[PDB]
């Protein structure tokens, strides 16, 4: 029922990997990956505003970091 | 402060003095999230006064330090 | 500049060009912030150009890109 900011980040980070998961051929597609990535951040920045945290925070930031190492920390820059 | 430099040394001094004594609450999320919003209120306060954007390249060097410092080891 | 990821690659020419001769003053922080603000305006415009989100995540690893090579090593505070 997503009553805090820590569960309201799983809630966006699972929505976010239920998008990921099955496009692995596509993680590098710079131009299609913005958008599941579009909707992270911005699922991030509603439930802060939602919970009266500031944006970016430090848990957000983390979040996105994390998605930078497992998914686009080794594409090429020009495909 | 007579310059941006100083005024983030300044920025970040005010961030330390509340972050030092509460260690064992570097990762309650919810709680940490109000200095660190002072931080980047500061760094952007602090640029736009200096008349220099916002992000920029030592605002960045100083969120990756407490991150580095504060958050890397916190369980998510 | 026929997509997104050519537009980057036209916007990061076009600081690396400004950068390099300034190579002694990339720790100059107040004067470094000029091509950098340019940088960052130059990936957001052809960002809401291609109506992709901004910040996204190859504009991110631009970003990364330039703290990496630029600013890693630099002192916060200049002598
Ligand atoms: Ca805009
Ligand atoms: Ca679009």
Same mark, same amino acid.
């Given at each position: 029922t997503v009553?805090?900011? =820590?569960? $309201?980040?799983? %809630?966006?980070?699972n929505h976010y990997?239920?998008?990921m998961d099955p496009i692995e051929k596509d993680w590098?597609?710079? $131009?299609? &990956?913005?958008?599941?990535?579009?909707? @992270?951040?911005?699922? @991030? =920045?509603? %439930? $802060? =505003? @939602?919970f009266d945290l500031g944006f970016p925070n430090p848990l957000a930031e983390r979040? &996105? %970091? =994390?998605?930078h190492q497992i998914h686009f920390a080794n594409c090429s820059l020009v495909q």
């Open positions: 009553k805090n900011y =820590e569960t $309201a980040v799983q %809630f966006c980070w990997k239920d998008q590098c597609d710079w $131009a299609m &990956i913005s958008r599941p990535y579009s909707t @992270l951040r911005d699922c @991030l =920045e509603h %439930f $802060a =505003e @939602l979040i &996105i %970091f =994390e998605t």
